[PDB]
Structures are given as structure tokens and as C-alpha cells.
């Protein structure tokens, strides 16, 4: 949960699961970005944010 993560302040797992490449699903209500480019898909953009 992104909200309970935000209220607690102590992360300690989102740091670990991201540094050591762990599979994860972040439940939230984010806004997104649309993208219409094959060059931006080959360039591996979605894993850099």
C-alpha cells in the first residue's frame, strides 16, 4: 500500500526490494503517462522512474 507507506515514514522494504530487484506490486491511485513510441519501448524507459 502506497498510502500506509506514506503515513508510516519508515520505508525499509521498498528500499530493499528495489535495490536487490525483487518482484513487487505497488497498490495506489497514481497518475500515469501515455507513450506512443517503439524507440521509447526498446530504450527500456518504464524501469527508470
Amino acid at each position: 500500500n502506497l498510502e500506509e507507506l506514506m503515513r508510516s515514514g519508515d520505508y525499509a522494504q521498498i528500499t530493499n526490494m528495489l535495490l536487490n530487484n525483487q518482484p513487487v506490486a505497488l497498490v495506489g491511485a497514481l497518475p500515469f503517462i501515455t507513450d506512443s513510441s517503439v524507440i521509447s519501448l526498446i530504450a527500456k524507459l518504464d524501469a527508470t522512474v
Binding site: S8, D10, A12, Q13, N16, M17, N20, Q22
Partner: protein, 397 residues
């Protein structure tokens, strides 16, 4: 191995300290340990079982941390932690049963199961917690070559043995001499007999002796010595040495004369006691040497003098015996005793899942066959399995 004890120590404390209504400062340092278990264990996957009828299970850890923000713990905080503890405590049962069931002959002190070999990486070393139990403290002192010690109450140091020895015999079996004994558990009952009652012995004294060697060296024992063997006191019929015929033994019992008990170590007399019954000590020994003798009484009332004639028909046979019993001692290798149930947990797992006979242990985990030939290859396996059985006893009785 050190991190398998550290998983069970903080799951035992998590069911005891995380209760409803308790103050947060009572559990403020356990939760920092329990959260740091979970961070190390996530993302990994394990596999236990496969031998005998022990089923194959797969383990996978994806859990969330505990909250660190309450003042008094409530029923939401307890019930969200019990459904995490109950998955770990099921994992530790199936790793401990996977290790008590396996054995090796080259180096038995190494881990044998697939899961315990994987827990011995430096990734999992941060789960390490205090090592305060008796078996995990002696696991660490002995791993650095320092002196260890286990304290026992009535240790099973003697294998079962019940036999005799005839120093004088004939096929009629009516004029005999020798000793009889029972060595079982932690108790020795020896009894010497003489049918003629020393009528032709020099100075009417017959000498007896019985020497019991041990398998391991005991230290600071408390021993009770009583001057009667109550088991070899009644009339019985006994077979011969090769099972051919039977012979009759009708005892009357005198008191043991000139008793000397010696406690040897590499042939050196450490302790000795001469006509001193009751409780005695024995600081360091590995061989017990009992010595006692029969003396014909020089003065006899008319009711006694009919029992012991000069001629051949002896209907009442003289008997002199002792009784020794070890109450508590300190050994350095693992053994079995009368207080703790570590031998019973090992055999009950092997009998339940129909485990085949391996290369090291006797068939059926027979303790009489295991202490008889107690090789250093069996000692390293027996310590490795009693220590895992001690870890499992904290969580699951």
C-alpha cells in the same frame, strides 16, 4: 545451524511477549529482531522432505513488516502477527525433521538436508540471536576446540548385560564358584558365590573381583553404594554356558567382607574407598573396579552350623554381593538419561515415516547396540541430531 536456533528463539519469544494489552516498551527490542528476520527471509524459496514417507513441501516467503507505533498492543496487532508466526513455526518443524532423519559417514557434523545447507550462507547470518541454551552453547564451545560438558541425571552409560563366570565347575554342577552380574542403565549389581563356603580355602577366605570399563570418561559423579545384590538373592535355575543343561542355585547371604572400590583413569588410581557405604564421589574416572571377599564365620550357633558341612552335599550356597548406582555425572559427549527426552524425539520421527536403515546408526536406533560400539563417527552424528531435536522442542512439544 546457528541461524536455525536463532529462528526458533525469536518465534518462541514472539508467542510469549507479543500478547494483548502489554506495554510497547516491553517488546520494543523483539520487534526490531522480528522485522529483521522477515527482511532477510523474503524472496527466498526452500524445499524440505523427500526421504521415506516424509512428504515434499515447498516454502515461499513474502510477508510484511510489523507496526512500531502503538503504546499498548491491541487485538488487531496480535491477530495480524499470529498469522505470520504460524507460517514460520510450520517451516521450522519441517527443517528439523528433515535433519534428524539424515546421516553421513565422512563428516557427520556438517549439515545434511538441502534447506540447512542453504541457511549456512553469509546472507542469512544477520538473523543470528543469542545462544543461551545448553546444547547450542556446547555446539559453539566445541566448534572452537574448548572444553565442554553435559550434565546428566542417571546417564545410560552401561549397555545391557546379564551373564556369569564359573571359576570352578564340573558336569554335575554341585560345587561351583564365581560371580554373577547385571549391568543395565546406570546400575551395577554384582554377586559372588561359593558352594563350599571356604572350607578348604587358605585362611577360609575367598577373593572376588569384577572390573567394568566405560566407553566415555565421566567427571564429578555422585555414586550410591549398598552392600547387597537383591537380584541374586532368591533360588533360581540357570542354563549352562552353551545352553546344554541347567543348574540350580540356592543362596544364603553373608555380609561382604573387605570391600574396596577403585576408580581408574588410564590405569591410575584416582579414588579409592575401603568399607565405606552410602554416598561417595568420583572426580574423574573411566573404569570401575569392585573388589570384595567372602569369609567363613569362625563362630556359629547350632542353627547356622547345620547349613555348612564338611562333606560334599551342599544344599545352602553362600553368596556375597554389592550394588552400585550412579545418580548424576558430567560427561563431555552426548548420552541418554532419565530426565530429558531427546532420544525419544529422534526415534519417534524415524519410526513414524518408515525410514530405511542407513550406514551409521543401528537398525531401530537401538541404544544397547549404539553405546556398545560408540565410534567417533557415530558421536559426531549423534550430537548433530540431538541438537536439532533440542531446537524443535522449543516450538513443538
Amino acid at each position: 545451524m546457528d541461524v536455525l536456533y536463532s529462528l526458533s528463539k525469536t518465534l518462541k519469544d514472539a508467542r510469549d511477549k507479543i500478547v494483548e494489552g502489554t506495554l510497547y516498551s516491553n517488546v520494543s527490542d523483539l520487534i526490531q529482531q522480528f522485522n529483521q528476520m522477515i527482511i532477510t527471509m523474503n524472496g527466498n524459496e526452500f524445499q524440505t522432505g523427500g526421504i521415506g514417507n516424509l512428504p515434499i513441501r515447498n516454502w515461499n516467503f513474502n510477508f510484511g513488516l510489523l507496526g512500531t507505533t502503538l503504546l499498548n498492543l491491541d487485538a488487531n496487532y496480535v491477530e495480524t502477527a499470529r498469522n505470520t508466526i504460524d507460517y514460520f513455526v510450520d517451516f521450522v518443524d519441517n527443517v528439523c525433521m528433515d535433519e534428524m532423519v539424515r546421516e553421513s559417514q565422512r563428516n557427520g557434523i556438517a549439515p545434511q538436508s538441502d534447506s540447512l545447507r542453504k541457511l549456512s550462507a553469509i546472507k542469512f547470518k544477520r538473523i543470528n540471536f543469542d545462544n543461551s541454551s545448553e546444547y547450542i552453547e556446547n555446539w559453539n564451545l566445541q566448534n572452537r576446540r574448548q572444553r565442554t560438558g553435559f550434565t546428566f541425571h542417571k546417564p545410560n552409560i552401561f549397555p545391557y548385560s546379564a551373564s556369569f563366570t564359573l571359576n570352578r565347575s564340573q558336569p554335575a554342577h554341585d560345587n561351583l564358584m564365581g560371580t554373577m552380574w547385571l549391568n543395565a542403565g546406570s546400575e551395577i549389581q554384582v554377586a559372588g558365590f561359593d558352594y563350599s563356603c571356604a572350607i578348604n580355602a587358605p585362611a577360609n577366605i575367598q577373593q572376588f573381583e569384577h572390573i567394568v570399563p566405560l566407553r566415555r570418561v565421566l567427571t564429578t559423579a555422585t555414586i550410591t553404594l549398598l552392600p547387597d545384590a537383591e537380584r541374586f538373592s532368591f533360588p533360581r535355575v540357570i542354563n549352562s554356558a552353551d545352553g546344554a543343561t541347567t543348574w540350580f542355585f540356592n543362596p544364603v547371604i553373608l555380609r561382604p567382607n573387605n570391600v574396596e572400590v577403585e576408580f581408574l583413569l588410564n590405569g591410575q588410581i584416582i579414588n579409592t574407598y575401603q568399607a565405606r557405604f552410602g554416598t561417595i564421589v568420583a572426580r574423574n574416572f573411566d573404569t570401575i573396579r569392585l573388589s570384595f571377599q567372602l569369609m567363613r564365620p569362625p563362630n556359629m550357633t547350632p542353627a547356622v552350623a547345620v547349613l555348612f558341612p564338611n562333606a560334599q552335599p551342599f544344599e545352602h550356597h553362600a553368596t556375597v554381593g554389592l550394588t552400585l548406582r550412579i545418580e548424576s555425572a558430567v560427561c563431555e559427549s552426548v548420552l541418554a538419561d532419565a530426565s530429558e527426552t531427546l532420544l525419544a524425539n529422534v526415534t519417534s520421527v524415524r519410526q513414524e515415516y518408515a525410514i530405511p536403515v542407513g550406514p551409521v546408526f543401528p537398525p531401530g536406533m537401538n541404544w544397547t547396540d549404539l553405546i556398545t560400539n560408540y565410534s567417533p563417527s557415530r558421536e559426531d552424528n549423534l550430537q548433530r541430531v540431538f541438537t536439532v531435536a533440542s531446537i524443535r522442542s522449543m516450538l513443538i512439544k
